[PDB]
Amino acid sequence: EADHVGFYGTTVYQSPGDIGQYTHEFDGDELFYVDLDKKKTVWRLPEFGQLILFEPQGGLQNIAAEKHNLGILTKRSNFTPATNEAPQATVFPKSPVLLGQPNTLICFVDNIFPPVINITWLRNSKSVTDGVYETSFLVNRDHSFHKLSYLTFIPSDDDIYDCKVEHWGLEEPVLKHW
Amino acid sequence: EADHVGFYGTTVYQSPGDIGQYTHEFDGDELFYVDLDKKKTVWRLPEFGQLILFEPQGGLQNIAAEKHNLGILTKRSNFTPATNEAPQATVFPKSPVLLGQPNTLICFVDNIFPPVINITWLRNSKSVTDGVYETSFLVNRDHSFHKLSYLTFIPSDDDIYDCKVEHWGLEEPVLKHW
Amino acid sequence: RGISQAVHAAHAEIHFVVQFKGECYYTNGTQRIRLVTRYIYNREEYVRYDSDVGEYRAVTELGRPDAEYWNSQPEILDRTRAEVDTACRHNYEGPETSTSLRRLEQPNVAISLSRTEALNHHNTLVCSVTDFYPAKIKVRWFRNGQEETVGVSSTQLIRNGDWTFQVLVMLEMTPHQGEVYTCHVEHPSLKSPITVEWSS
Amino acid sequence: RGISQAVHAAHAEIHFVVQFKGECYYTNGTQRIRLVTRYIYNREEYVRYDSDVGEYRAVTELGRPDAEYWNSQPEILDRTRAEVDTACRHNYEGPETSTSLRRLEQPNVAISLSRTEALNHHNTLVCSVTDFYPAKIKVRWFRNGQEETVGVSSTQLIRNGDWTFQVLVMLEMTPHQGEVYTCHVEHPSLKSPITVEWSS
Ligand SMILES: *[C@@H]1O[C@H](CO)[C@@H](O)[C@H](O)[C@H]1NC(C)=O
Numbered sequence: 142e143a144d145h146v147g148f149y150g151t152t153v154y155q156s157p158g159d160i161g162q163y164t165h166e167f168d169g170d171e172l173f174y175v176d177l178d179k180k181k182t183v184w185r186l187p188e189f190g191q192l193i194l195f196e197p198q199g200g201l202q203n204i205a206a207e208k209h210n211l212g213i214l215t216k217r218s219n220f221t222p223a224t225n226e227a228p229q230a231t232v233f234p235k236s237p238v239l240l241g242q243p244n245t246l247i248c249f250v251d252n253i254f255p256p257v258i259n260i261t262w263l264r265n266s267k268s269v270t271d272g273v274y275e276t277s278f279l280v281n282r283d284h285s286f287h288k289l290s291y292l293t294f295i296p297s298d299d300d301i302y303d304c305k306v307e308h309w310g311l312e313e314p315v316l317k318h319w
Numbered sequence: 320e321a322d323h324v325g326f327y328g329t330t331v332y333q334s335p336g337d338i339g340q341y342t343h344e345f346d347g348d349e350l351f352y353v354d355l356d357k358k359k360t361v362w363r364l365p366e367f368g369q370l371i372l373f374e375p376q377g378g379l380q381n382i383a384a385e386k387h388n389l390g391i392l393t394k395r396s397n398f399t400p401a402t403n404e405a406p407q408a409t410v411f412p413k414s415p416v417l418l419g420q421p422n423t424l425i426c427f428v429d430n431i432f433p434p435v436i437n438i439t440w441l442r443n444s445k446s447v448t449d450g451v452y453e454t455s456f457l458v459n460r461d462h463s464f465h466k467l468s469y470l471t472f473i474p475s476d477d478d479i480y481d482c483k484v485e486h487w488g489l490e491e492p493v494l495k496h497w
Numbered sequence: 498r499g500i501s502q503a504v505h506a507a508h509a510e511i512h513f514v515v516q517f518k519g520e521c522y523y524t525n526g527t528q529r530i531r532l533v534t535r536y537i538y539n540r541e542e543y544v545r546y547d548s549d550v551g552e553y554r555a556v557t558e559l560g561r562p563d564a565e566y567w568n569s570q571p572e573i574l575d576r577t578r579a580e581v582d583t584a585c586r587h588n589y590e591g592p593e594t595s596t597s598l599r600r601l602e603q604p605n606v607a608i609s610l611s612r613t614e615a616l617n618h619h620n621t622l623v624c625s626v627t628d629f630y631p632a633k634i635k636v637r638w639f640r641n642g643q644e645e646t647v648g649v650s651s652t653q654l655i656r657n658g659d660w661t662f663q664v665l666v667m668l669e670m671t672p673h674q675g676e677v678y679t680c681h682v683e684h685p686s687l688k689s690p691i692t693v694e695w696s697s
Numbered sequence: 698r699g700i701s702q703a704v705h706a707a708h709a710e711i712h713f714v715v716q717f718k719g720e721c722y723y724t725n726g727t728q729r730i731r732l733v734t735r736y737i738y739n740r741e742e743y744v745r746y747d748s749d750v751g752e753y754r755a756v757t758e759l760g761r762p763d764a765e766y767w768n769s770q771p772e773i774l775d776r777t778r779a780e781v782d783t784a785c786r787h788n789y790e791g792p793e794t795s796t797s798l799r800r801l802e803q804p805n806v807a808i809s810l811s812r813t814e815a816l817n818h819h820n821t822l823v824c825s826v827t828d829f830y831p832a833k834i835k836v837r838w839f840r841n842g843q844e845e846t847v848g849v850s851s852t853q854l855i856r857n858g859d860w861t862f863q864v865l866v867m868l869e870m871t872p873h874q875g876e877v878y879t880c881h882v883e884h885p886s887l888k889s890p891i892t893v894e895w896s897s
């Protein structure tokens with residue numbers, strides 16, 4: 142066919158916090174992630190989780206393998222820590238903006254290292270949550286990550302929006318207005 | 320066919336200086352202009368001047384008609400003069416720039432009112448002339464004009480160029496570098 | 498068919514600029530011909546004659562007199578009216594057909610790489626179709642046979658001023674392989690489509 | 698064909714981040730399959746296993762040990778080698794074929810006018826083809842039947858993140874008449890080309 146690349150086995154782990162993640166993607170799209178604290182596979186496309194199965198244990202093994210490897214590498218590196226990077230976000234509609242017409246607003250945050258972020262939406266300058274969704278930390282070739290959030294809205298009113306990006310290789314949260 | 324618009328009879332005349340011009344164009348391209356001080360039709364495309372003829376007298380009549388009309392209108396207007404506009408130029412190659420490869424550089428000056436301009440090229444900051452060519456004052460819908468100049472060059476050396484645009488609805492000459 | 502006619506500028510009744518514009522608009526060749534003459538004082542059109550209207554009309558106060566006068570001078574008003582046939586119909590079917598309308602300039606396709614980068618995220622290929630007349634031209638970017646439309650950007654038409662135009666079409670690519678990038682060009686002056694090739 | 702396989706992360710010999718990347722590259726479907734696993738410490742890949750190389754290789758000093766160890770552990774080195782078949786060949790031909798590869802999302806063509814202008818010189822028409830999967834799509838601007846390529850500009854692909862993309866194609870026009878502007882779109886999910894119309 143065409144070029145296709147599968148991302149099968151992707152594991153992340155961070156030390157203070159024992160925070161980890163495991164995912165699978167195809168052509169840059171997230172197939173599913175495995176809920177670790179509750180040990181279950183969460184398909185981004187439900188219809189997909191009904192035709193194909195992935196036992197969580199698999200993901201769970203790699204997380205352990207990495208917990209293991211982190212402790213070993215951290216030492217080997219004589220404890221060099223992660224140097225911080227500043228993310229860049231982008232807000233845009235998933236569909237043609239029509240007056241009164243329900244839409245979903247998307248915020249694209251890239252250059253995320255580490256996989257620690259608080260991306261937050263607000264017309265106000267204080268939050269509003271319904272239709273607020275998030276993807277897992279998507280992997281980048283340069284070993285940085287990127288995350289997307291959504292907002293479900295219909296356009297006339299209060300119309301000012303903002304995607305607040307809090308990350309410490311960073312300062313103003315990043316208020317990206319739309 | 321397609322839309323085509325002929326510009327047949329175009330005459331310009333300015334008072335102090337008795338400076339005038341007469342031209343003919345087709346689809347925005349200058350067919351010819353009539354040398355007034357020497358009463359002869361100068362075809363931009365010579366090959367064209369050999370298959371079609373335009374007696375200069377025609378152009379000459381309109382120039383007179385306008386000399387006439389100017390004196391009458393100027394009075395009628397209770398002598399209101401022309402308000403000055405500032406031109407904007409653009410320099411660009413007529414062909415793909417190849418190292419050592421002869422080319423012609425073009426300077427596009429628009430928003431020219433009045434039809435009085437000194438557009439001048441220089442690597443130096445003092446002129447250089449050969450291949451220096453100019454078109455007549457081309458007419459714009461808004462009754463402003465635009466003029467183009469050319470320069471014949473081969474690209475490696477002294478490589479700095481400049482199109483100097485002197486016009487009094489204007490100040491720095493307009494040094495547009497390339 | 499070898500004599501180019503002008504549009505006569507009328508005489509008014511007995512830094513300063515004036516302009517007289519004879520303008521002829523051809524819809525589908527000479528099917529529908531329209532004549533518009535305009536008298537300008539500096540940058541203000543004051544009077545106008547339009548085929549569609551049939552007579553002189555003042556565009557501003559400065560034109561009120563010339564309209565009332567010229568429209569009443571049978572010689573003038575009737576010479577201008579027929580000017581659409583004497584000068585336009587004539588100039589189109591005659592001079593222009595054996596000259597402007599027959600001119601065909603074959604373009605020059607050349608793919609170069611942005612002067613120095615294909616950097617800062619996504620390589621940009623540039624196709625330079627230059628020195629063609631007339632303006633109707635079709636330039637498409639292709640990838641191994643498949644027509645590429647996404648990531649493609651074309652400039653507006655560039656009128657050189659010497660009866661030749663040019664056009665540059667960009668393509669931002671994230672490439673791979675024995676891919677071929679064919680710059681398809683289609684110009685009326687050409688028998689069959691000229692094409693340039695480039696590969697990874 | 699209903700079980701999705703992972704790529705096993707090896708065990709080293711006995712703000713901090715590590716990443717393990719199982720990556721499988723399919724050239725022309727499963728004709729040529731390539732397996733690349735990478736072990737990352739923060740943002741530094743230290744060791745890698747590549748199908749093309751057949752064994753673990755240290756990318757940096759931090760990886761020298763894991764390579765020499767894993768390559769000597771028959772169980773490990775041989776489990777990884779076959780991982781291209783166990784996980785990739787399997788996941789491609791199996792899971793992915795009944796899911797990602799069969800997904801077809803019909804785009805939504807809509808021509809709007811730039812939010813408020815068609816001003817400051819040359820009107821710009823925008824075609825918005827959104828919500829399609831997969832990414833191969835052909836969107837062309839047409840003028841009364843003639844395909845318009847000049848003055849046309851397409852954005853790069855926009856990945857929405859929900860398994861849907863979108864793309865906007867601009868056209869700067871200097872219009873006239875009963876002209877029709879047809880936004881031709883061609884997507885694999887479609888039987889015959891969807892088209893939207895707009896007129897002056
Ligand atoms: C004018 O247009 C019509 C329809 O497009 C065509 O049949 C006719 O031949 C055209 N006339 C010329 C001179 O091209």
Ligand SMILES: *[C@@H]1O[C@H](CO)[C@@H](O)[C@H](O)[C@H]1NC(C)=O
Pocket residue numbers: 142725726727728
């Ligand atoms: C692989 O590519 C070749 C040539 O393009 C083709 O003949 C073959 O059928 C392809 N295989 C698949 C699974 O599409």
